[PDB]
mmCIF file with all atom_site columns, C-alpha atoms in Angstrom:
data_model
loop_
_atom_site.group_PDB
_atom_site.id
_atom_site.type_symbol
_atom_site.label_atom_id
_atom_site.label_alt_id
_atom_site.label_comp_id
_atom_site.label_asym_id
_atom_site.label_entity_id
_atom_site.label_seq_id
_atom_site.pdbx_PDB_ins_code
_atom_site.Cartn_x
_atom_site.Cartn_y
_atom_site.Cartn_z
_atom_site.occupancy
_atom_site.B_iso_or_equiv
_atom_site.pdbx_formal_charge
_atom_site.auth_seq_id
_atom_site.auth_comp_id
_atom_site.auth_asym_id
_atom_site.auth_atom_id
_atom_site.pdbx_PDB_model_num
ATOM 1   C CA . UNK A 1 1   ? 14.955  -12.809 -4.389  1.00 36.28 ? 1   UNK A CA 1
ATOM 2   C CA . UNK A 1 2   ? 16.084  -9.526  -3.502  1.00 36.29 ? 2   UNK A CA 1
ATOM 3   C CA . UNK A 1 3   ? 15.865  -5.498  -5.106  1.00 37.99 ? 3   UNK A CA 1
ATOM 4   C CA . UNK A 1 4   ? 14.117  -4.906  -8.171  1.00 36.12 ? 4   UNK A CA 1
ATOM 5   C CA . UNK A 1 5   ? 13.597  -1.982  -10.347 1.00 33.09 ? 5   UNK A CA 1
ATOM 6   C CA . UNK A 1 6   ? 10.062  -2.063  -11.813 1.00 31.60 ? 6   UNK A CA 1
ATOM 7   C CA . UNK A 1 7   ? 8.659   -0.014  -14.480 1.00 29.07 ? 7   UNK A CA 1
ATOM 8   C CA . UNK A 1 8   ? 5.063   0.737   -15.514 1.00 32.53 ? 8   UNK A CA 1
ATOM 9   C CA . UNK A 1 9   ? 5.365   0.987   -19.006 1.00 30.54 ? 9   UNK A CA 1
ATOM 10  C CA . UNK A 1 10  ? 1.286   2.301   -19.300 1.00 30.27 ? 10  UNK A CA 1
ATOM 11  C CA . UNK A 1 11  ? -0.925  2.680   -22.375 1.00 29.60 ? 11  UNK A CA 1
ATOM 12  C CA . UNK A 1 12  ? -1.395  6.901   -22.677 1.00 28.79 ? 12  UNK A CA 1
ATOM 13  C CA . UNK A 1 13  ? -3.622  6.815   -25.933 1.00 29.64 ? 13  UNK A CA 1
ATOM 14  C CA . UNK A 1 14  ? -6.735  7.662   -28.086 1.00 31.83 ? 14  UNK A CA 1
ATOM 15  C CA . UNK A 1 15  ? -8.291  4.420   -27.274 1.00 28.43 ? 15  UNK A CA 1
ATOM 16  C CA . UNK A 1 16  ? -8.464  4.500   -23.272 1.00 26.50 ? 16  UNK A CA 1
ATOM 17  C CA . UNK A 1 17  ? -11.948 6.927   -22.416 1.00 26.32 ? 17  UNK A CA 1
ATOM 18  C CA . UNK A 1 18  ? -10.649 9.154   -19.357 1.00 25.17 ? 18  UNK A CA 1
ATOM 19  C CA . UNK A 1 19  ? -12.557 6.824   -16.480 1.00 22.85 ? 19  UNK A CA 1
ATOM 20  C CA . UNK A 1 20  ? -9.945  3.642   -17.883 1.00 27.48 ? 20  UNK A CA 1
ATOM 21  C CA . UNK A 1 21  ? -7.023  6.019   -17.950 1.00 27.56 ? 21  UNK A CA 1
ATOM 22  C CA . UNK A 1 22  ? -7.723  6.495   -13.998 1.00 27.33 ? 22  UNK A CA 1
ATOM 23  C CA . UNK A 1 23  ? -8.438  2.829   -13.315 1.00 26.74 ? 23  UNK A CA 1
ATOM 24  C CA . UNK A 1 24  ? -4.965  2.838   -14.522 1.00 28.05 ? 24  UNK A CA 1
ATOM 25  C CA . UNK A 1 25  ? -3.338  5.530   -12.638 1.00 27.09 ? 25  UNK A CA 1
ATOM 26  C CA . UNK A 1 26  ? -5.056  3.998   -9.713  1.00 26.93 ? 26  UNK A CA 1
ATOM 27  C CA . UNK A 1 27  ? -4.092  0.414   -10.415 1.00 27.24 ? 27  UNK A CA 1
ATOM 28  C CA . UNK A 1 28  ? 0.133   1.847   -11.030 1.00 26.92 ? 28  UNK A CA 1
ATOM 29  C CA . UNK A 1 29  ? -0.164  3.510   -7.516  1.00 25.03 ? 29  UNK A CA 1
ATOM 30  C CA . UNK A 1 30  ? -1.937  0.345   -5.619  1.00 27.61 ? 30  UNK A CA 1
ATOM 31  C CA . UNK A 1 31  ? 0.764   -1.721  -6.902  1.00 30.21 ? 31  UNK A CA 1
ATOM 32  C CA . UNK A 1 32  ? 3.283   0.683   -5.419  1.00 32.09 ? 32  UNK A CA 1
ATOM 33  C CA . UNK A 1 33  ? 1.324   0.793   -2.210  1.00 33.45 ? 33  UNK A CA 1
ATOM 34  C CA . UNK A 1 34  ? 1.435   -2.429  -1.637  1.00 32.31 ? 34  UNK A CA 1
ATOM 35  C CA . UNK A 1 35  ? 5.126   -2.979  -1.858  1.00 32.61 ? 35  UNK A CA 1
ATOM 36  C CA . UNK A 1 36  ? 6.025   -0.223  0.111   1.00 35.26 ? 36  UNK A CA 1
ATOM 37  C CA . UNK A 1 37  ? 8.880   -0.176  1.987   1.00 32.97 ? 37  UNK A CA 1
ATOM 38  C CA . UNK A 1 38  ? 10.165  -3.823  0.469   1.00 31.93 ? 38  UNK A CA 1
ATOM 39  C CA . UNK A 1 39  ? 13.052  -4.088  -1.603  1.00 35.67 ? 39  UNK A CA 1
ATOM 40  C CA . UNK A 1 40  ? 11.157  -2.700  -5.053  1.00 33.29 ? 40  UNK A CA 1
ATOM 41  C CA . UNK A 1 41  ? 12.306  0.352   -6.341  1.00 34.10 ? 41  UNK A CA 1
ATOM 42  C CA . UNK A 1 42  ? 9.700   1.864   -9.116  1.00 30.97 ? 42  UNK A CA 1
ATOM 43  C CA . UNK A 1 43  ? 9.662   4.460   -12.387 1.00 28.21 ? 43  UNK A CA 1
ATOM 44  C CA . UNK A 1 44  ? 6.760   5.363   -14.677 1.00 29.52 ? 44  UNK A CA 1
ATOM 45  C CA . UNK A 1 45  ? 6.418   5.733   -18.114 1.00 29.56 ? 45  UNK A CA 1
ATOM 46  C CA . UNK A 1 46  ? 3.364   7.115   -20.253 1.00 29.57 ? 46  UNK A CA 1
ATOM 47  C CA . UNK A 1 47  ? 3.516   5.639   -23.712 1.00 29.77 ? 47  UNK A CA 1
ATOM 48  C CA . UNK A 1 48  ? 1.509   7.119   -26.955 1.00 28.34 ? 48  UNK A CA 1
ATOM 49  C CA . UNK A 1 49  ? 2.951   8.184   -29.980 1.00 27.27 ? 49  UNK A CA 1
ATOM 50  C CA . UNK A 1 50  ? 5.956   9.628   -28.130 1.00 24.43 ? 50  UNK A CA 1
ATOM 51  C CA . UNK A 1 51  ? 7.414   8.153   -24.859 1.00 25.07 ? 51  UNK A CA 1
ATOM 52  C CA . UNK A 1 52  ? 7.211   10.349  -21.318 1.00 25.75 ? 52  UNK A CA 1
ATOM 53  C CA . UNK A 1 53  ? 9.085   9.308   -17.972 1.00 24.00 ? 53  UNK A CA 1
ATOM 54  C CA . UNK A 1 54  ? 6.583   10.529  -15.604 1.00 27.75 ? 54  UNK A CA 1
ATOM 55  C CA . UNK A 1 55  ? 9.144   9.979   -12.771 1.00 26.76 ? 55  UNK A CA 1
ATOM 56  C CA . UNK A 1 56  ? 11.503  7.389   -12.595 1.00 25.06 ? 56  UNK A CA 1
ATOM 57  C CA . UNK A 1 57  ? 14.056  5.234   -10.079 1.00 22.01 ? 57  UNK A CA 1
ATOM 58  C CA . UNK A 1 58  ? 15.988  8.021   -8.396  1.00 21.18 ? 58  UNK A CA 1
ATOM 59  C CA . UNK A 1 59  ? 11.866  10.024  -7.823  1.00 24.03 ? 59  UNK A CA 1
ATOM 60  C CA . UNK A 1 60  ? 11.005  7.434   -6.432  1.00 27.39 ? 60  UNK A CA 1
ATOM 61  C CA . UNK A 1 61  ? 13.753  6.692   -3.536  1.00 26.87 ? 61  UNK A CA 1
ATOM 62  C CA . UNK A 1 62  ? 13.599  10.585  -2.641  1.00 28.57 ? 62  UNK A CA 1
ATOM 63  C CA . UNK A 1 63  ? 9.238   11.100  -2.583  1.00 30.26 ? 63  UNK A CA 1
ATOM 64  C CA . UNK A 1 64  ? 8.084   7.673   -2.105  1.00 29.48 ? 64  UNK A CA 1
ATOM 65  C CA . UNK A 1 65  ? 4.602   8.492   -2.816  1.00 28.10 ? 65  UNK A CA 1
ATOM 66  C CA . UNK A 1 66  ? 2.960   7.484   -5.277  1.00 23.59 ? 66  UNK A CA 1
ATOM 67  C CA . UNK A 1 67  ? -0.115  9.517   -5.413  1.00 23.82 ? 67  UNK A CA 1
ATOM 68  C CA . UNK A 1 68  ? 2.328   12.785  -5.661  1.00 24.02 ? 68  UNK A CA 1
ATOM 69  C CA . UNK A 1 69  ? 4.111   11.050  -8.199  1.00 21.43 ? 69  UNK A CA 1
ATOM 70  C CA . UNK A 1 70  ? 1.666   10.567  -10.540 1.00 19.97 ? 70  UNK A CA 1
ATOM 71  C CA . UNK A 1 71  ? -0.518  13.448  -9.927  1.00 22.12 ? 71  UNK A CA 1
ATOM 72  C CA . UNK A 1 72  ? 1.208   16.127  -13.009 1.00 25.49 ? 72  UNK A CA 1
ATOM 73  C CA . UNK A 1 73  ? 0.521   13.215  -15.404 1.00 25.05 ? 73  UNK A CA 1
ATOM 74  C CA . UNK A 1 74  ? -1.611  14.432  -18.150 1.00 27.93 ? 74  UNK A CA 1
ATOM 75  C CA . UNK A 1 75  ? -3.237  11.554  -20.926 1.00 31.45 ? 75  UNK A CA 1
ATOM 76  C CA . UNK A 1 76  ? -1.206  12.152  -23.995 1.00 30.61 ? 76  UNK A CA 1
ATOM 77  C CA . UNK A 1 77  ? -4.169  10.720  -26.294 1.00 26.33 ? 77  UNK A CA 1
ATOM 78  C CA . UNK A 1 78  ? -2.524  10.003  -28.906 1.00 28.56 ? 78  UNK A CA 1
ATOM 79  C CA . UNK A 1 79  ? -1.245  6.583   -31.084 1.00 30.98 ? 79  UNK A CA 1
ATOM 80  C CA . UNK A 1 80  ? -0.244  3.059   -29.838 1.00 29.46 ? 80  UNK A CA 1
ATOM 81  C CA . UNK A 1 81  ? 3.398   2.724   -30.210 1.00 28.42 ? 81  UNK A CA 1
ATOM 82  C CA . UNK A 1 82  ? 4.246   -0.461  -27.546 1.00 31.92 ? 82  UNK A CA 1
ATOM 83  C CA . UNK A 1 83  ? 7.332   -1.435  -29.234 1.00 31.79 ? 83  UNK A CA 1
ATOM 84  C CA . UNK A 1 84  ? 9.265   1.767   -29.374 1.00 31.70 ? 84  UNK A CA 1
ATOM 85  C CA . UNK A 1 85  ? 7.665   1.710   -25.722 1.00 34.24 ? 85  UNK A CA 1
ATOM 86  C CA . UNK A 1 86  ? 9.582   -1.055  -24.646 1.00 34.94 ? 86  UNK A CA 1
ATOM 87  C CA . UNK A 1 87  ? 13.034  0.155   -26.215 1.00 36.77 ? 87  UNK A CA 1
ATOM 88  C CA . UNK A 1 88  ? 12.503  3.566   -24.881 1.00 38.50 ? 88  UNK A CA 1
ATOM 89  C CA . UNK A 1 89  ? 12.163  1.866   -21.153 1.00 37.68 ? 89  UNK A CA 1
ATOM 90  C CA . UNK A 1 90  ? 15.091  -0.645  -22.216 1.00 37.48 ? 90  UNK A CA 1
ATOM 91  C CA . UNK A 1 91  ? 17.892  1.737   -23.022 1.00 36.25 ? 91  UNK A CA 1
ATOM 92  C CA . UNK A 1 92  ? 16.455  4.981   -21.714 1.00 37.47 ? 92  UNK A CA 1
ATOM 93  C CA . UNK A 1 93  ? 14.352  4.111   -17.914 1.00 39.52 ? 93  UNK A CA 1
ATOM 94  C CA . UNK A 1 94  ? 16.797  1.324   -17.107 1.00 40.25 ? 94  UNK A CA 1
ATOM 95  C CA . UNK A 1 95  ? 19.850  3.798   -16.472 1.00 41.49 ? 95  UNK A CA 1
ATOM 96  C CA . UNK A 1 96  ? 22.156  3.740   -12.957 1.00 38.57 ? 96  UNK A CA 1
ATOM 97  C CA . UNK A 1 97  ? 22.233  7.823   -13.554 1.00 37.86 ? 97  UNK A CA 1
ATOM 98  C CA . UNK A 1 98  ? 18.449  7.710   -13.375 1.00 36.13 ? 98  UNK A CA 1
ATOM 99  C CA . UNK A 1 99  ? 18.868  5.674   -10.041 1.00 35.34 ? 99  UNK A CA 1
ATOM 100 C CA . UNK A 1 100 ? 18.555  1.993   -11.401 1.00 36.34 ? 100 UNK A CA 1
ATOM 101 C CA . UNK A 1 101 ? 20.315  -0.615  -9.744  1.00 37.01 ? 101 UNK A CA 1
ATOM 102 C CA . UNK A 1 102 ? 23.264  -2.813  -11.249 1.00 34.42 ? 102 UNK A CA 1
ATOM 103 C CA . UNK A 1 103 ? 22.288  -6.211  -9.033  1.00 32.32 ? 103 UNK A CA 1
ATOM 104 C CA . UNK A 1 104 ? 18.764  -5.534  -9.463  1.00 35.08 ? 104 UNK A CA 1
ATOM 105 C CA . UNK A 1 105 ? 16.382  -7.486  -11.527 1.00 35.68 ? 105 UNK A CA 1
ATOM 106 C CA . UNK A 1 106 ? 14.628  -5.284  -13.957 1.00 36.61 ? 106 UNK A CA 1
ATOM 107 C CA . UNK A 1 107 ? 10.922  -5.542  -13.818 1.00 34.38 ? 107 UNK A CA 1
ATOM 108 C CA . UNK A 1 108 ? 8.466   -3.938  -16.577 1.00 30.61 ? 108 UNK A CA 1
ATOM 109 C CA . UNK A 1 109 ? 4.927   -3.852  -16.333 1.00 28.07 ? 109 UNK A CA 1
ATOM 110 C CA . UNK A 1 110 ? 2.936   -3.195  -19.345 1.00 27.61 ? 110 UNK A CA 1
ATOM 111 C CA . UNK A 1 111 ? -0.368  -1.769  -18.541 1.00 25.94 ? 111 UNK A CA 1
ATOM 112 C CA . UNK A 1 112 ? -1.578  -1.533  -21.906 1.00 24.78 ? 112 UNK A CA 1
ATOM 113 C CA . UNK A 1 113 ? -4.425  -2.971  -24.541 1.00 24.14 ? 113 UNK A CA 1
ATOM 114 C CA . UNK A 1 114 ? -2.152  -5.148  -26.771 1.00 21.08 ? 114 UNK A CA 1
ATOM 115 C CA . UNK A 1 115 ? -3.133  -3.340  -30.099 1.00 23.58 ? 115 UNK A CA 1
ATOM 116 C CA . UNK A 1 116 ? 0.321   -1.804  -31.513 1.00 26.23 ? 116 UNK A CA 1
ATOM 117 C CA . UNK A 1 117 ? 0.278   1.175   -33.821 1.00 21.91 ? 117 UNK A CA 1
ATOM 118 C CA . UNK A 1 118 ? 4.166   0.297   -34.462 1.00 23.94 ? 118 UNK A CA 1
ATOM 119 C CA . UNK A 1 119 ? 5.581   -2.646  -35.420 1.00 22.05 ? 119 UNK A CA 1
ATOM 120 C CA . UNK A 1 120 ? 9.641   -3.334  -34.832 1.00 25.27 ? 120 UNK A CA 1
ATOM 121 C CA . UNK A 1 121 ? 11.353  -5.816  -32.388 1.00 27.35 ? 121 UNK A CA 1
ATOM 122 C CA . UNK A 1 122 ? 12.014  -5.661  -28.672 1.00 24.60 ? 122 UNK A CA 1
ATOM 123 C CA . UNK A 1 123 ? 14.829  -7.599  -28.849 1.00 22.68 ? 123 UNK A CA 1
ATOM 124 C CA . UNK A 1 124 ? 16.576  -5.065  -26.323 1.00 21.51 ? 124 UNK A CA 1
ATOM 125 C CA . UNK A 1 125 ? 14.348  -6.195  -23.492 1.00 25.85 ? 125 UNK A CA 1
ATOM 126 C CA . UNK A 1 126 ? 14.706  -9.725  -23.546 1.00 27.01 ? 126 UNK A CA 1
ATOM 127 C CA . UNK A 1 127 ? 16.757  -9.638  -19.989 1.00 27.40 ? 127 UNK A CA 1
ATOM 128 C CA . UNK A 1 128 ? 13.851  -7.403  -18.820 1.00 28.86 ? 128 UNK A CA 1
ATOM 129 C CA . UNK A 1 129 ? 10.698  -10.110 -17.167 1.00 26.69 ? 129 UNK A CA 1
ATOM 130 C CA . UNK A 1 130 ? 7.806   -8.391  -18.784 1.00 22.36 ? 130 UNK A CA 1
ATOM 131 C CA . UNK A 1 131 ? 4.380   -8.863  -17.279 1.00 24.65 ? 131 UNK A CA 1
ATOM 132 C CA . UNK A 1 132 ? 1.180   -7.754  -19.468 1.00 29.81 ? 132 UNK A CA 1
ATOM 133 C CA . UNK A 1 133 ? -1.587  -5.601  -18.030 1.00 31.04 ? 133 UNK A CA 1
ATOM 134 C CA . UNK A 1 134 ? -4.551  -5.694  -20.223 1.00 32.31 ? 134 UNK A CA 1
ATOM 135 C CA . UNK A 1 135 ? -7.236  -2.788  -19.556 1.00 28.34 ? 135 UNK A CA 1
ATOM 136 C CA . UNK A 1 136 ? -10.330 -2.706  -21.510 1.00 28.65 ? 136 UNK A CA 1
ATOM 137 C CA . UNK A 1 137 ? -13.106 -5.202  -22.096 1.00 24.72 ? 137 UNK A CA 1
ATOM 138 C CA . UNK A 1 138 ? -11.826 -7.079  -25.108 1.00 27.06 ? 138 UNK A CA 1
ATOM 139 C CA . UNK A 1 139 ? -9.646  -9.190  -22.984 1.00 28.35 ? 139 UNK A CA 1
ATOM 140 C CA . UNK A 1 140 ? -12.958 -11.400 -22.424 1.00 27.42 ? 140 UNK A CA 1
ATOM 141 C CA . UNK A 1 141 ? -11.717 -14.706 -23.855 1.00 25.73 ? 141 UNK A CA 1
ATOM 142 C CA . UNK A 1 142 ? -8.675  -16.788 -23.128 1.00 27.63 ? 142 UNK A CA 1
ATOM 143 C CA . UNK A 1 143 ? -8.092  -16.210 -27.123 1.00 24.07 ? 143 UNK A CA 1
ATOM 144 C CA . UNK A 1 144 ? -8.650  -12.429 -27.281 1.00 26.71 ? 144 UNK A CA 1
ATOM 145 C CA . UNK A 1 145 ? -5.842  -12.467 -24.533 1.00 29.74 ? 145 UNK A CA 1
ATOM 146 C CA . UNK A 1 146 ? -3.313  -13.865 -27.554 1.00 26.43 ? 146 UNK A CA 1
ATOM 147 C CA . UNK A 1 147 ? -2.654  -10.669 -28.819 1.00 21.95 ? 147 UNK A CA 1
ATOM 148 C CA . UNK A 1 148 ? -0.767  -9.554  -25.325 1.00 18.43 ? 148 UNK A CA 1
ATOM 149 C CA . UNK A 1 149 ? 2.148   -12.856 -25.735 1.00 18.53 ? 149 UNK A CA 1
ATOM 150 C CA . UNK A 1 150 ? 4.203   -11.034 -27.793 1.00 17.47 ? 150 UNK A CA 1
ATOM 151 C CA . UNK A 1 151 ? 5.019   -8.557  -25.353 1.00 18.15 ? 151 UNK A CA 1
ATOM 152 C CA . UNK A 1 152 ? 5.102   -10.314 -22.080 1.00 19.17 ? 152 UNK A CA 1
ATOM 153 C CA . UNK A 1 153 ? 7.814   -12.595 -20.990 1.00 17.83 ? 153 UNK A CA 1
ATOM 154 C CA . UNK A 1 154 ? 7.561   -17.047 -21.421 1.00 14.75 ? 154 UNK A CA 1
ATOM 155 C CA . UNK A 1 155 ? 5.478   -18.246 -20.474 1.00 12.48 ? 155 UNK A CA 1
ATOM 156 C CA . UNK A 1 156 ? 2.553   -16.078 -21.269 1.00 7.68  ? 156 UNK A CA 1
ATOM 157 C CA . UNK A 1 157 ? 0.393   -17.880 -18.342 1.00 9.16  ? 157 UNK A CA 1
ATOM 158 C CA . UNK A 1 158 ? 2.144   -16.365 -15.893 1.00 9.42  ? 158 UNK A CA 1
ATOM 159 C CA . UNK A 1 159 ? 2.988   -13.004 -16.961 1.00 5.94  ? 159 UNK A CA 1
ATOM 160 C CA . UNK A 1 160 ? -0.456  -12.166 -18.237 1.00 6.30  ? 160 UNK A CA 1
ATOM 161 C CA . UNK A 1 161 ? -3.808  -11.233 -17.160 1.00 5.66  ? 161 UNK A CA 1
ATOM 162 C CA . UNK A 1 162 ? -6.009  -8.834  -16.406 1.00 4.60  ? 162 UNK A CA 1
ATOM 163 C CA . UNK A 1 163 ? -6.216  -5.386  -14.793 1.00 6.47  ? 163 UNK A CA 1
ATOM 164 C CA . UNK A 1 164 ? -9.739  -6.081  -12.848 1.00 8.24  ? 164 UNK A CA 1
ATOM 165 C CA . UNK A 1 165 ? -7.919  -8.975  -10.563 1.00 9.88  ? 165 UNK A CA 1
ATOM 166 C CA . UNK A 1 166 ? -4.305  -8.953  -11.459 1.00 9.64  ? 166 UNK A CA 1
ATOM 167 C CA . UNK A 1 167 ? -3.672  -12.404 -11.291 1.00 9.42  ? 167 UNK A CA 1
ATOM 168 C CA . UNK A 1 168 ? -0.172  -12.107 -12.363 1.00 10.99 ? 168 UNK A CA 1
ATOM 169 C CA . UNK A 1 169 ? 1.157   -10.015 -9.600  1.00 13.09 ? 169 UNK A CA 1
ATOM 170 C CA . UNK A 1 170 ? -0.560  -10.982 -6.514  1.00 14.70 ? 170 UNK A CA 1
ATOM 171 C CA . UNK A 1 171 ? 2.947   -13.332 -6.012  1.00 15.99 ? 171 UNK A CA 1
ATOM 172 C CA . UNK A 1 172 ? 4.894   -9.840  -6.309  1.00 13.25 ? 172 UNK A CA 1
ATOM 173 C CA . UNK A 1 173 ? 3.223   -9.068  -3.041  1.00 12.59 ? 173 UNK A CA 1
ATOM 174 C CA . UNK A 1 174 ? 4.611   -11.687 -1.429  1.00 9.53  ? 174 UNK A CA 1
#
């Protein structure tokens, strides 16, 4: 492999209760933790209704801590729009100026529940591997966990699961 620019494309709205919202925070800055100092190079984005870079690439390189990074970020609360979510990242987060990387891969991680308020295509991410985070309880049936394919990269076994083990990132690590 080699560098990567990763993006945590995470679920901001009405349906997360506050404690979820925090398992979530928490679960973005493990993941950064944990590939500290490797070649990953990470930006965050709050999705809702609207779309919020809560820091991105070049924040990253400069602070490298995660905690700090995320600790202004305030739960919008407000609809479910994944798709526009996954443009915005596409043709807004993914920028050299905003300290992305030409030969790197581009990573997104969708920390989100899988229920869209929007509907549209993401047809601008399809060079982005998209790996599906799914936070709430619902996601207690291999069928239930259908609904989270259509954003998530092919094949759907192994770029989602859930946010309790993360089964789908644990090779990220290593």
């Amino acid at each position: 492999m080699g560098n990567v620019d990763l993006v945590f494309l995470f679920d901001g709205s009405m349906s997360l209760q506050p404690d979820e919202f925090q398992k979530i925070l928490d679960f973005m800055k493990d993941v950064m933790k944990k590939l500290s100092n490797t070649s990953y190079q990470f930006a965050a984005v709050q999705f809702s209704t609207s779309y919020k870079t809560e820091f991105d690439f070049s924040d990253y390189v400069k602070r490298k801590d995660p905690d700090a990074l995320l600790k202004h970020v305030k739960h919008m609360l407000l609809l479910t729009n994944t798709f526009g979510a996954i443009n915005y990242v596409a043709t807004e987060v993914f920028r050299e100026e905003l300290g992305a990387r030409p030969d790197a891969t581009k990573v997104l991680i969708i920390i989100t529940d899988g229920e869209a308020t929007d509907s549209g295509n993401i047809d601008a991410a399809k060079d982005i591997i998209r790996y599906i985070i799914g936070i709430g309880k619902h996601f207690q049936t291999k069928e239930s966990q259908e609904t989270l394919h259509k954003f998530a990269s092919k094949p759907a076994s192994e770029f989602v699961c859930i946010l309790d083990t993360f089964e789908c990132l644990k090779d990220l690590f290593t």
